[PDB]
Design a protein around this ligand. Structure first.
Ligand SMILES: [Fe+3]
Ligand SMILES: [Fe+3]
Lengths: 202, 202
């Protein structure tokens, strides 16, 4: 069996309280993330060799996949990848920026605080469903960008370092329309050690 | 003062229970709808003569508005129009299809039940944020279409007859990920008399 799988949450469903509620963690992981994986798997039944691609490879080749599944793959491989990534980029442990990522953030944004303000503004300005990302080019240059729906920076050959889901399902139970508060609180659970790994894997 | 305004909810905030919760009605009308109107008004300060356009006229002329506000108008005039329309198309009163709309639905979809099934499927399949619509061409031909975000059929010269908001803020508090249940329940509050008026105004 080489079907795609849901990665078990890397911590307890309530580990991120009080910043993100346990009910949302359960829905977000067990329902939304699960649905993306199931839908992806269903679509690939027609082309079982695609089960041997990684999610990255699917996302890097959307324009060359068979026309009849390309959009479904974009959306569902997108959702699967983005959510695996998102749950991995948060943690109940306390972390801070360090090593090359810490330096790069200062280099590219002037300071951690300037980076944080830009990120929060971008997250806040996403219209409709989508994501805010800290991304790196192949040479380690950092920038902030957003994607709609489940589109991913990976498809534009950019490497996600951190990313924030701003689909309303990610925050409505606790914050309702107050996305600004959700964004501000989320920085308490960003896994900067994971982010460093992401940046190093360039 | 010819600034755009929020239309007061046409019924009590709990009038649509148990199909839509009062808390959602309050957020949806008092926060989300309100924000679209405020943002629209803010953007038009630069071009005060646009306050004399109707929402329809703004939406029918997005490609010819000044470049610097066109997208903001699309999104916010869109949200303002769509929400005014949406709250008007629901009611606590019991209503059924009648007159020309009743006939047209049978003509164009075969039966009310076939129309309802197609509408629910379209509503269910919207990916990300958006709307499902029953629309009419200028000659009264009916069809079902969806729009993303706050895009409107009005911009494609189609006349909305009914429409369902499937942004997650419209249903998450009560239904969470279970959009199917939200869609099914919503048919209990569709204002078919309003829909008939919409159809007659062709
Ligand atoms: Fe999500
Ligand atoms: Fe809405």
């Amino acid at each position: 069996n080489n079907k795609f799988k849901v990665k078990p949450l890397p911590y307890a469903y309530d580990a991120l309280e009080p910043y993100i509620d346990k009910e949302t963690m359960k829905l977000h992981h067990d329902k939304h993330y699960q649905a993306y994986v199931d839908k992806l798997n269903a679509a690939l039944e027609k082309y079982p060799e695609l089960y041997n691609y990684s999610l990255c490879e699917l996302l890097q080749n959307l324009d060359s996949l068979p026309k009849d599944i390309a959009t479904t793959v974009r959306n569902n491989a997108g959702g699967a990848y983005n959510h695996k990534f998102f749950f991995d980029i948060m943690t109940p442990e306390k972390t801070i920026p360090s090593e090359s990522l810490k330096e790069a953030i200062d280099r590219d944004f002037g300071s951690f605080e300037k980076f944080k303000q830009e990120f929060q503004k971008s997250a806040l300005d996403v219209f409709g469903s989508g994501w805010a990302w800290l991304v790196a080019t192949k040479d380690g240059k950092l920038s902030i960008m957003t994607t709609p729906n489940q589109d991913s920076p990976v498809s534009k050959n950019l490497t996600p370092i951190i990313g924030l889901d701003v689909w309303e399902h990610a925050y409505y139970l606790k914050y309702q329309n107050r996305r600004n508060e959700y964004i501000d609180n989320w920085f308490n659970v960003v896994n900067w050690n994971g982010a460093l790994e992401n940046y190093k894997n360039l």
